[PDB]
From a paper:
Toll-like receptor 4 (TLR4), a superfamily of LRR proteins, is the principal receptor mediating innate immune responses against infections by Gram-negative bacteria. In this process, myeloid differentiation protein 2 (MD2) recognizes various lipopolysaccharides (LPSs) released from the Gram-negative bacteria, forming a complex with LPS at its hydrophobic pocket. In an attempt to prevent the systemic immune response caused by LPS, a TLR4 decoy receptor was constructed by combining LRR modules from the TLR4 ectodomain and VLR. The constructed decoy receptor was shown to attenuate the TLR4-mediated signaling process by trapping MD2, implicating a potential therapeutics for bacteria-induced sepsis and inflammation.
Analysis of the interaction interface inferred that four residues (Thr-110, Val-132, Val-134, and Asn-156) on the decoy receptor were in position to make additional hydrophobic interactions with Leu-108 of MD2 when substituted for larger amino acid residues. In the case of Val-132 and Val-134, replacing these residues with phenylalanine or leucine might create a strong hydrophobic interaction. To analyze the interaction interfaces of other single mutants (M41E and V134L), we obtained the modeled interaction interfaces by superimposing their apo structures into the complex structure of the wild-type decoy receptor/MD2. For this, we determined the crystal structures of the single mutants in free form at a −2.4 Å resolution. In the case of the V134L mutant, the larger Leu-134 was able to have a strong hydrophobic interaction with Leu-108 on MD2, which seemed to have a positive effect on binding affinity. This result also validates our strategy for the design of variants with high binding affinities for MD2. Superposition of the mutants on the wild-type revealed that their original backbone structures were retained, which represents the structural characteristics of repeat proteins.
Residue numbers in the entry: 27 to 303
Write the structure that this text describes.
C-alpha cells in the first residue's frame, strides 16, 4: 500500500510518493492522512470519498492550484485541514463544502489576496484560522465572519496589511463574544485608527515587528480580557507627549507585554518613559 501504515486502519504517511491523485488502497476507517509533497495539482469533487472517516488531512506543498466545488464534500468529520504551501490560484465558492466539523484550517503560503472571496463562510465549527504568510492587504473582516461564532484563533501575520481601521473589526460586533487570539505581526502596518478595539474582547494581540511609530490614546482601554500583547521591534517615537499613553499603559501592564517595545534611536524601553505634564 506504498504509503506507510503508522497505525492500522488509522494513520498513514503518503508524503513524497509522487502521487497524482488520492490513493484508494487504504482502509475506509482512516482518520489521519498526510499527503504532503505529492504533485496533486488539482482537487476535483469528491476527492476523498473513500475516506469519510478522516479527521486530519495534510496536503502541504502538493502543488495544488485549484479546488473544485465539493472537493471535500464527503469528509464530514474532518477536524484539521492543512493546505500550506499550495500555489492556489482559484477557489470555488463551494470549495470547502462538506466540511461541517472543521476546527483548524491552515493555509500558510497559498497566494491568498483577500479574505473577501475566501469560501469559509459556512464553517461554524472553525476554531483556528491560520492564513499567515499570504498576500492579504486589508484587515477588513468580511461580514461572513459573523457566522464563524467559534473562531477563537486568527493568524494574519506576514501578510501585506498596512493599517487597522475602525471598520475592520466591525463584523465582530454583530455576533457572539469569544476569546479571540489575534496575530498581526510581521506586517508593513504603520497606522491604527483610534478606537479600533472598543467593545472587542481580545485574549492576545500581536502587533510586533511592523512599522508602528505611534498608537491612538486609549487604544487598549477596556481590554480586561487581554492577557498577552506583543509590540516589540517597532520604530516607536518616544517624543512627548505623543508617547505619553503607551508609556504609562505598557508600564502598568508590564506582565502582559511579551518582549519590549523600544524607542527608535535610543533603544529605550517604551514602558520606562515618563512624559512631563
Ligand atoms: C484493521 O481492519 C481490518 C479489517 O480489514 C481488521 O481485520 C479484520 O478483523 C475482523 C474482526 O474485527 C475480521 O472479521 C470477522 O471478525 C469476527 C469477530 O467476531 C470473526 O468472527 C470473523 O471470523 C471475522 O474474522 C476480519 O477477518 C479481519 N480481516 C483481515 C484484515 O484479515 C484488523 O483487525 C484491523 N486492525 C486493527 C486496527 O485492529
Ligand atoms: C452563514 O453565513 C453564510 C455566508 O453569508 C450564509 O450563506 C448562511 O446562510 C449563514 N448560515 C448558515 C446556513 O450557516
Ligand atoms: C473488517 C471489519 O469491518 C469493517 C471495518 O469496521 C473494519 O475493517 C473491521 O475490521
Amino acid at each position: 500500500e506504498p504509503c506507510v501504515e503508522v497505525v492500522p486502519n488509522i494513520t498513514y504517511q503518503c508524503m513524497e510518493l509522487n502521487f497524482y491523485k488520492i490513493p484508494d488502497n487504504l482502509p475506509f476507517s482512516t482518520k489521519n492522512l498526510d499527503l504532503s509533497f505529492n504533485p496533486l495539482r488539482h482537487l476535483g469533487s469528491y476527492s476523498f470519498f473513500s475516506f469519510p472517516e478522516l479527521q486530519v488531512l495534510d496536503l502541504s506543498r502538493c502543488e495544488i492550484q485549484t479546488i473544485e466545488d465539493g472537493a471535500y464534500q464527503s469528509l464530514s468529520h474532518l477536524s484539521t485541514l492543512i493546505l500550506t504551501g499550495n500555489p492556489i490560484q482559484s477557489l470555488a465558492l463551494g470549495a470547502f463544502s462538506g466540511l461541517s466539523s472543521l476546527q483548524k484550517l491552515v493555509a500558510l503560503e497559498t497566494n491568498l489576496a483577500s479574505l473577501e472571496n475566501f469560501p469559509i463562510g459556512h464553517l461554524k465549527t472553525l476554531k483556528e484560522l491560520n492564513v499567515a504568510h499570504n498576500l492579504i492587504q486589508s484587515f477588513k473582516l468580511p461580514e461572513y465572519f459573523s457566522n464563524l461564532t467559534n473562531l477563537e484563533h486568527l493568524d494574519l501575520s506576514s501578510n501585506k496589511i498596512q493599517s487597522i481601521y475602525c471598520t475592520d473589526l466591525r463584523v465582530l460586533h454583530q455576533m457572539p463574544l469569544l476569546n479571540l487570539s489575534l496575530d498581526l505581526s510581521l506586517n508593513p502596518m504603520n497606522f491604527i485608527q483610534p478606537g479600533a478595539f472598543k467593545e472587542i474582547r481580545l485574549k492576545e494581540l500581536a502587533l510586533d515587528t511592523n512599522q508602528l511609530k505611534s498608537v491612538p490614546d486609549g487604544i487598549f482601554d477596556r481590554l480586561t480580557s487581554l492577557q498577552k500583547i506583543w509590540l516589540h521591534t517597532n520604530p516607536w517615537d518616544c517624543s512627548c507627549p505623543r508617547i505619553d499613553y503607551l508609556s504609562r499603559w505598557l508600564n502598568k501592564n508590564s506582565q502582559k507585554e511579551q518582549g519590549s517595545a523600544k524607542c527608535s534611536g535610543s533603544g529605550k524601553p517604551v514602558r520606562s518613559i515618563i512624559c512631563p505634564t
